[PDB]
Design a protein around this nucleic acid. Structure first.
Ligand SMILES: [Cr+3]
Ligand SMILES: [Cr+3]
Length: 327
DNA sequence: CATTAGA
DNA sequence: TCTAATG
């Protein structure tokens, strides 16, 4: 957690580079299990050799460790951090829409900067276009004060269209967070569960609603169960307009909400931990359900859920307010 | 780890 | 169809 820091961070920097700037999925995979393993190790790595005893730890990384241990740096690390092309890819990727593949491509093309991207808005797809259009605002945080106002409106039209709609703003927001990065809304309707073969419109209805009133202003991707947009709070009585903000809506079988809700609310650790527990408590938790284990090794048979509570009750735990679902 | 775009 | 990009 800190004894092995520098090794782990250098290592991940090592990993992420083969992954993006190069196409070294393997090398890249390599740096991670190592950076993972050296993370666990309860003692101060003193030398490569020492490290080396480890699992996944090879000659290659070992060699790494020493230079890092010995000198407060790493050239390869110092040469990449410097490398303009490489840099370039790391940069371009901030463009929502831009992944490594694309990054590289554009680079090969000569497109390295933001401006480069403007000059060739053609070479870009709608997504990317957007991305590009909302780069600053996309990278900005979202004040809960704002989280509140958005949530507000959103629950309004939801309700407005059909009063039989259940929305919940999951995530860190849900979890009290003084700030968030994009709002996620979990949706469901009685009229849609596991088997009841859809009602795409279900989703449809609402996005449409949101647009109609100006909530949603773009569309990144609209599907029958998963919309992924952009939003903006009606800039008041002038002098102050709201920045563009990512948003995502999702349909869900009424019959699989709460798990989902439970789930999406995190925190990553709260989940894992709760989940781990469910294993003792003779169960299984996953993003959609909760099945009772059968000694044979495994089992199934999704237990019925009407609230965040059922799941809790199920594994006989203390209801944890989302506030303190931190871990 | 599943959903969407796109070519 | 496969491939990329989000989450
Ligand atoms: Cr990206
Ligand atoms: Cr998200």
């Amino acid at each position: 957690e800190t004894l092995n820091g520098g090794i782990t961070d250098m290592l991940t920097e090592l990993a992420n580079f083969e992954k993006n700037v190069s196409q070294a999925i393997h090398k890249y995979n390599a740096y991670r299990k190592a950076a993972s393993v050296i993370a666990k190790y309860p003692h101060k790595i003193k030398s490569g050799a020492e490290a080396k005893k480890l699992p996944g730890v090879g000659t290659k990384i070992a060699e790494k460790i020493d230079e890092f241990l010995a000198t407060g740096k790493l050239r390869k690390l110092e040469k990449i951090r410097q490398d303009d092309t490489s840099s370039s890819i790391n940069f371009l990727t901030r463009v929502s829409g831009i992944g490594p593949s694309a990054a590289r491509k554009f680079v090969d093309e000569g497109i390295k900067t933001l401006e480069d991207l403007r000059k060739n808005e053609d070479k870009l797809n709608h997504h990317q276009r957007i991305g590009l259009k909302y780069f600053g605002d996309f990278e900005k945080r979202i004040p809960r004060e704002e989280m509140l106002q958005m949530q507000d409106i959103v629950l309004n039209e939801v309700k407005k269209v059909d009063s039989e709609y259940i929305a919940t703003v999951c995530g860190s927001f849900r979890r009290g967070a003084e700030s968030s990065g994009d709002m996620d809304v979990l949706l469901t309707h009685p009229s849609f569960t596991s088997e009841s073969t859809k009602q795409p419109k279900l989703l449809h209805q609402v996005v449409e609603q949101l647009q109609k009133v100006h909530f949603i202003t773009d569309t990144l991707s609209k599907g029958e169960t998963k919309f992924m947009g952009v939003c903006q709070l009606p800039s008041k009585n002038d002098e102050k307009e709201y920045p563009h903000r990512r948003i995502d809506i999702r349909l869900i079988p009424k019959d699989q909400y709460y798990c989902g809700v439970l789930y999406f609310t995190g925190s990553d650790i709260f989940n894992k931990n709760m989940r781990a527990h469910a294993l003792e408590k003779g169960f299984t938790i996953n993003e959609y359900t909760i099945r009772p284990l059968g000694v044979t090794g495994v089992a199934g048979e999704p237990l019925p859920v009407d609230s965040e509570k059922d799941i809790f009750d199920y594994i006989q735990w203390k209801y944890r307010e989302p506030k303190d679902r931190s871990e």
